[PDB]
Design a protein around this ligand. Structure first.
Ligand SMILES: [Mg+2]
Ligand SMILES: [Mg+2]
Length: 755
DNA sequence: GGTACGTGATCG
DNA sequence: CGATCACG
């Protein structure tokens, strides 16, 4: 009766065996199940058809595949009774081999639940929930530093340091002499990698924490381990970490453990212009962290001078990764438990995918047939669908932020907004959405409204248990639990409109918007009669000020205002005071910038802090934002842009500030469109350079005729005497696009930002 | 074990 | 223009 941390399957004598990884009174336990069978459902035109359908065949791994057993079942689909056939298979890999053969059949109307991974199928069907109980897990943070030189192939340079940290402290393994108490000196890169393997096997952590270990630390360790002819038996079954393709990036799993990569977690949880470990640590713990750049690390390693500085940086990377892991894991653990899927998968999911996993489990519990994901055609048509305010211009002072999101679950429940209740035939009583006119049947509670009501009731009970609890330990745990419910409940509104959703419903999303708007118009009116000016309104919230008022007065009146409105609004409809800002400006929907009273700049949909934008554009943008938010001076910002563009015209900007970086993601011959970085890469390959995916190309755009691709040069080939950069390209395609959206909030056009 | 998302630049 | 490509 332990705590489930993960589930997977292995194949033995061609048959699948489910593995359930558990933590039981401090011990690792692995449970095996050989009896759970894979399946799909088929809706037939007539029961007679089953005789032809059950005899459908496929091929996989040299052997033919068959439907093992067929079972007629009664379920609910679209809020209606339905009869479907459960088609059993021997192996989960049989489903993608046979599903289209079954769908093709003239007597098959449709197939269902055919893309549910076997391990997730098991957890749902067996009613098993990960991360339950008070079982205390162990953690280890791991990081690495590599020797890197400009534009090298991924893994060419050796790993030079490996760091790790836990409650026992932060340590470094290196293969050059460094005299520090936390540094372990070994003889080679090979021996350093073997020492990390030995630390992991001996500490036997349940959780391995990394900062972007999915794309950097583990892929690099695996590439270097390959070149060195050594294994990484990091799995509790002695398997090597496994790379999984998630999008165009990677996801790394370590069997029997939780590889907890903070990078996708932090990116979703907090809003920052850059997700450097230093920026993240400072945002969470309000403490500064020093960065040692790759070129400084290379110089120190090659010279053998300044190595103590590099080992201190490596040690801190692990130490802060450990502190951030401990800060962010409790919430990921409660979200896992709430949706009933492992932390590994949940920590790497969007809120929309968390909702879908909660719905899939609840669908099995309620005997409801799950709808299919859209095909390419349907997915694109949803992206195209219409769904039928503009911010105040200028620079505003003393901005109060109000959040609307905790309004929508209540609207979904009271109006029974669900795809299964939308425009029902022979409906006795219905709710009509204002303006849009969509009808939602009142005769039965909809699948989604029913679930949401249970979620909200469960949160109220947790909150009541928190007030009546004298134990600070359970109060902490219950606090993460009610927060996890709030996060899941507030994701449903956005889920109805998510184009990849199974329970997608455009009319549901518009109806919720139409009913929500009546409360938004009430808030807006009540604020305006109180002297407040509304500057920005989104379905998510609003920003307001009291023009010419004192900051404490704006705060006091706003805090009084939320207390008042919440007392007027029925049920669980709730307005939330998000915060206060010293200054701010708004461009369009989700394109704005603010500054708090502590001097921190918070922006949405404006900042370009990425390697594929030149330093000159990023530097000019940061300077424009500082002139506006820190100096309250838009005229200073306009003068900054005019000076920079003139300097580009007169070749007064250093070439190092003009470099663009773009990664090669495939073999060069696989490109359809030859962008500047690929044109530069082809020229390098023609010279004998081993161009491989992962290589990052640095280039400068030169003056000349034609498209930019024909005028781009590799940075290492740029000679300031011979080459002349394209000033027009850096003015019009780099610097002005970086600042034109920001300046538009003050009445300037691209044309107003030059002499 | 199915293999992200939203967004904005550049190619053809 | 529509298609293709990359960032984090
Ligand atoms: Mg897994
Ligand atoms: Mg590091």
């Amino acid at each position: 009766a332990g705590m489930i941390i993960d589930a997977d399957y292995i194949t033995e004598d061609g048959k699948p065996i489910i593995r359930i990884f558990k933590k039981e009174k401090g011990e690792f336990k692995v449970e095996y199940d050989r009896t759970f069978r894979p399946y799909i459902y088929a809706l037939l035109k007539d029961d007679s058809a089953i005789d032809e359908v059950k005899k459908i065949t496929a091929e996989r791994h040299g052997k033919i595949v068959r439907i093992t057993e067929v079972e007629k079942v009664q379920k609910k689909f679209l809020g209606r009774p339905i009869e479907v056939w459960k088609l059993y298979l021997e192996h989960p890999q049989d489903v993608p081999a046979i599903r289209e053969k079954i769908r093709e059949h003239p007597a098959v109307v449709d197939i269902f639940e055919y893309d549910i991974p076997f391990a997730k199928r098991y957890l749902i069907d067996k009613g098993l929930t990960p991360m339950e109980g008070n079982e205390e897990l162990t953690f280890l943070a791991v990081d690495i530093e590599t020797l890197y030189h400009e534009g090298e192939e991924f893994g060419k340079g050796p790993i030079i340091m490996i760091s790790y940290a836990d409650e026992e402290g932060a340590k470094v393994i290196t293969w050059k002499s460094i005299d520090l108490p936390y540094v372990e000196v070994v003889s080679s890169e090979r021996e350093m990698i073997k020492r990390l393997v030995k630390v992991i096997r001996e500490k036997d952590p349940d959780v391995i924490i990394t900062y972007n270990g999915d794309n950097f630390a583990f892929p690099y360790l695996l590439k270097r381990a390959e070149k060195l002819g050594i294994k990484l038996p990091l799995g509790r079954d002695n398997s090597e970490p496994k790379m999984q393709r998630m999008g165009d990036s990677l996801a790394v799993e370590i069997k029997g453990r939780i590889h907890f990569d903070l990078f996708p977690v932090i990116r979703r949880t907090i809003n920052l212009p850059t997700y450097t470990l230093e920026a993240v640590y400072e945002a969470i713990f309000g403490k500064s962290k020093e960065k040692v750049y790759a070129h400084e690390i290379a110089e120190a390693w090659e010279t053998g001078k300044g190595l103590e500085r590099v080992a201190k940086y490596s040690m801190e990377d692990a130490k802060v990764t450990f502190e951030l892991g401990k800060e962010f894991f409790p919430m990921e653990a409660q979200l896992a438990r709430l949706v009933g899927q492992p932390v590994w998968d949940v920590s790497r999911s969007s809120t929309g995918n968390l909702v879908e996993w909660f719905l899939l489990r609840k669908a099995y519990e309620r005997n409801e047939l799950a709808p299919n994901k859209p095909d390419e055609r349907e997915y694109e048509r949803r992206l195209r669908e219409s769904y039928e305010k503009e911010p105040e211009k200028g620079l505003w002072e003393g901005i109060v932020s109000l959040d609307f999101r905790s309004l929508y679950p209540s609207i979904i429940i009271t109006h029974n907004v669900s795809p299964d209740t939308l425009n029902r035939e022979n409906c006795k009583e219905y709710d009509v959405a204002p303006q849009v006119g969509h009808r939602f049947c009142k005769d039965f509670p909809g699948f989604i409204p029913s679930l949401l009501g249970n979620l909200l009731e469960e949160r109220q009970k947790i909150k009541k248990r928190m007030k009546e609890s004298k134990d600070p330990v359970e109060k902490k745990l219950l606090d993460y639990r009610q927060r996890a419910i709030k996060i899941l409940a507030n994701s449903y509104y956005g889920y109805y409109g998510y184009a990849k959703a199974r329970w997608y419903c455009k009319e549901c999303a518009e109806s919720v918007t139409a009913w929500g708007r009546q409360y938004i118009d009430l808030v807006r009116r009540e604020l305006e009669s109180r002297g407040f000016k509304v500057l920005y309104i989104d379905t998510d919230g609003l920003y307001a000020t009291i023009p010419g008022a004192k900051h404490e007065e704006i705060k006091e009146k706003a805090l009084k205002f939320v207390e008042y409105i919440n007392s007027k609004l029925p049920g669980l409809l709730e307005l939330e005071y998000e915060g206060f800002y010293a200054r701010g400006f708004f461009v369009t929907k989700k394109k704005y910038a603010l500054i708090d009273e502590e001097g921190k700049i918070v922006t949405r949909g404006l900042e370009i802090v990425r390697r594929d934008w030149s330093e000159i554009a990023k530097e000019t943008q940061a300077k424009v934002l500082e002139a506006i938010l820190k100096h309250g001076n838009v005229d200073e910002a306009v003068k900054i842009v005019k000076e920079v563009t003139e300097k580009l015209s007169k070749y007064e900007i250093p070439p190092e500030k003009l470099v663009i970086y773009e990664q090669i993601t495939r073999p060069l011959s696989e490109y359809k469109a030859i962008g500047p970085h690929v044109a530069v890469a082809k020229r390098l390959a023609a010279k004998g350079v081993k161009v491989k995916p992962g290589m990052v190309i640095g280039y400068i755009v030169l003056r000349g005729d034609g498209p930019i691709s024909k005028r781009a040069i590799a940075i290492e080939e740029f000679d300031p005497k011979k080459h002349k950069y394209d000033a027009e390209y850096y003015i019009e395609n780099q610097v002005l696009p970086a600042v034109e959206r920001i300046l538009r909030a003050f009445g300037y056009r691209k044309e107003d930002l030059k002499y």
